[PDB]
């Protein structure tokens, strides 16, 4: 989107969100990133929301088709169309990872921005891992783990236990442990420790920050209820 102003791309990305035009919103934010300037807190959220929606719809479709495909294995069309959706999903994940690698992460010097992008990197490698089956699945899983772990290390050094990004990072890393890494006990332990340390820090927060943190704390509890 090289001929459009950065501010216009950002403004149109907000309009696309309101219109629920998430593919447009992602293309706008991709153009904004490629302007080469760092992203503000709000702009990072727009980037993340745009691609989470796009890849979320692809993941849901992939799961529908993969389930039909496995039932048929109890012509080639079902596998072909699953492969087509799967290829588009991997393309979106590779696109996001390319934005993070060129050059969002290396220019993110603050903990809030660096943890945010590393959380994103873990998420989109996790999405790749969900459909991986061959020689690279283990390497893809380790790339997810490595990204999440570096984000965890920084967030524990640099952010309070109630920080929404720190909480969301831990939530997603615990889903990674349970769903991808076949480590349900690690998943449960991370969610428990994350919830308990946030609980003990709630007294420091304003009413608005209290609302933000307890919302994600509830997601951690929902998983623990499901896992234990």
């Amino acid at each position: 989107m090289g001929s459009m102003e950065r501010a216009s791309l950002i403004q149109k990305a907000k309009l696309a969100e309101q219109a629920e035009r998430y593919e447009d919103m992602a293309a706008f934010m991709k153009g904004a990133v490629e302007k080469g300037e760092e992203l503000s807190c709000e702009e990072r959220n727009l980037l993340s929301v745009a691609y989470k929606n796009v890849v979320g719809g692809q993941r849901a479709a992939w799961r529908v088709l993969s389930s039909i495909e496995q039932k048929s294995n109890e012509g080639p069309e079902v596998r072909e169309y699953r492969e087509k959706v799967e290829t588009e999903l991997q393309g979106v994940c590779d696109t996001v990872l390319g934005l993070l690698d060129s050059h969002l992460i290396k220019e993110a010097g603050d903990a809030e921005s660096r943890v945010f992008y590393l959380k994103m990197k873990g998420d989109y490698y996790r999405y790749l891992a969900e459909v991986a089956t061959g020689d690279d699945k283990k390497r893809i899983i380790d790339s997810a783990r490595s990204a999440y772990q570096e984000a965890m290390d920084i967030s524990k050094k640099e952010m309070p236990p109630t920080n929404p990004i720190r909480l969301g990072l831990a939530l997603n890393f615990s889903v990674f442990h349970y769903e991808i890494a076949n480590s349900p006990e690690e998943a449960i332990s991370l969610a428990k420790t994350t919830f308990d340390e946030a609980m003990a820090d709630l007294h420091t927060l304003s009413e608005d920050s209290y609302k933000d943190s307890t919302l994600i704390m509830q997601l951690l509890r929902d998983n623990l209820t499901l896992w234990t």
Partner: peptide
Amino acid sequence: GSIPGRRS
């Protein structure tokens, strides 16, 4: 459940 993260 992961972060829904689909609304800003």
